[PDB]
Design a binder for this molecule. Structure first.
Ligand SMILES: Nc1ncnc2c1ncn2[C@@H]1O[C@@H]2COP(=O)(O)O[C@H]2[C@H]1O
Ligand SMILES: Nc1ncnc2c1ncn2[C@@H]1O[C@@H]2COP(=O)(O)O[C@H]2[C@H]1O
Ligand SMILES: Nc1ncnc2c1ncn2[C@@H]1O[C@@H]2COP(=O)(O)O[C@H]2[C@H]1O
Lengths: 200, 202
């Protein structure tokens, strides 16, 4: 793909080990990012520093776009590396120059913003219409319907930690524990082992 | 003072239609094949649960593109209902013709994309409020947002606003009664005065 190679040729590309922070919320935004390899988590936090994952992003994804269209904006979220990453970066000023040469690069950025806005709106619906209990339930259902969920004699099976569920949903690992139990005891699931079994 | 030549050039390739107050301009699930633009008026963007309760995702106003999320990949559906809040003049262009404008002058894309940006900051802050803010703080914050805003008013004790307990409830996600309950107690902690659809934020 010649457009992405052209584009990458004006970026500078760096490695970020697993668990490092690429973008801090409140920081001034004057650069765009792009995932050559790996995956990051876009996350937000409350007062007690509890986190919610707005989105996993993966190779081929732009990051830090939101400040590109009016100056003086702050980073809106935390981006942390989920695996080891290679991350291309370019300034808003250079990027606006690439957009003039070949506006298709803006077209591919805007395609992702659109998708991201559909996906974030779906997540507002949930937080508005489901309570925490339901959101944990739904989350497990979703993991169990992913291509990588493996098969089980009595339903579907997935390996996730109370911790990833806590981040997906906005509560602690211990609160996840209490609620898995409540879920076990209404027979929605069976969480014997670090593996969970989901049903029907 | 708030139109310009790029817009007018854009607007002149559109069919510009007038919609009454309360008409829905876009239905969720519809094949997205057309871009809209609010030449005058304001709209609510809405989603629903299986039980037909409504959540207001956003208000949009004159200047604002609508119906843009299908633009970049074909075969998509509208992700939300968009409903006229006042009487509206709204422009429409097919995606295919709009892709063509973007080649003529990419600046049209930069204006749309700016707006998608601001939309995702706002929807992301909303995701934060619903996950982390309590109901009463969410209402407190909504009142503050309406009050800080033109369409708001002026008053001896602050700004004053017009909004029923139901639209409130649709913005924060709670019933009308609960809104009424929380408004009262917000009255008691000296934060507002509330006479029906009309509120004085201090
Ligand atoms: N709802 C979301 N989904 C995916 N990515 C997001 C979302 N909200 C913010 N981001 C990304 O995280 C970045 C944080 O820095 P910026 O706001 O500059 O740019 C932001 C977007 O790239
Ligand atoms: N979170 C949001 N904030 C503002 N506008 C939105 C949001 N989600 C959807 N929309 C608008 O609602 C429109 C519904 O149809 P589209 O998905 O074609 O285009 C959508 C966007 O313009
Ligand atoms: N838990 C909830 N989540 C989201 N929206 C709600 C909830 N309860 C009520 N609403 C919506 O917000 C509206 C506020 O006024 P009503 O109670 O008339 O109708 C309400 C619903 O349409």
């Amino acid at each position: 793909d010649p457009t992405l190679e052209w584009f990458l040729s004006h970026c500078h590309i760096h490695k970020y080990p697993s668990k490092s922070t690429l973008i801090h919320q409140g920081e001034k935004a004057e650069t765009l990012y792009y995932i050559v390899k790996g995956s990051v988590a876009v996350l937000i936090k409350d007062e007690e520093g509890k986190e919610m994952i707005l989105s996993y992003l993966n190779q081929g994804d732009f990051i830090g776009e939101l400040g590109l269209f009016e100056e003086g904006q702050e980073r809106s979220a935390w981006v942390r590396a989920k695996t080891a990453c290679e991350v291309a970066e370019i300034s808003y000023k250079k990027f606006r120059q690439l957009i003039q040469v070949n506006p298709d690069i803006l077209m591919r950025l805007s395609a992702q913003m659109a998708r991201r806005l559909q996906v974030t709106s779906e997540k507002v619906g949930n937080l508005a219409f489901l309570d925490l209990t339901g959101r944990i339930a739904q989350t497990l259902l979703n993991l169990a319907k992913q291509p990588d969920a493996m098969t089980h004699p009595d339903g579907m099976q997935i390996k996730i930690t109370r911790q990833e569920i806590g981040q997906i949903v906005g509560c602690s690992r211990e609160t996840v524990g209490r609620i898995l139990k409540m879920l076990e005891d209404q027979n929605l699931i069976s969480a014997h082992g670090k593996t969970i079994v989901v049903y029907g």
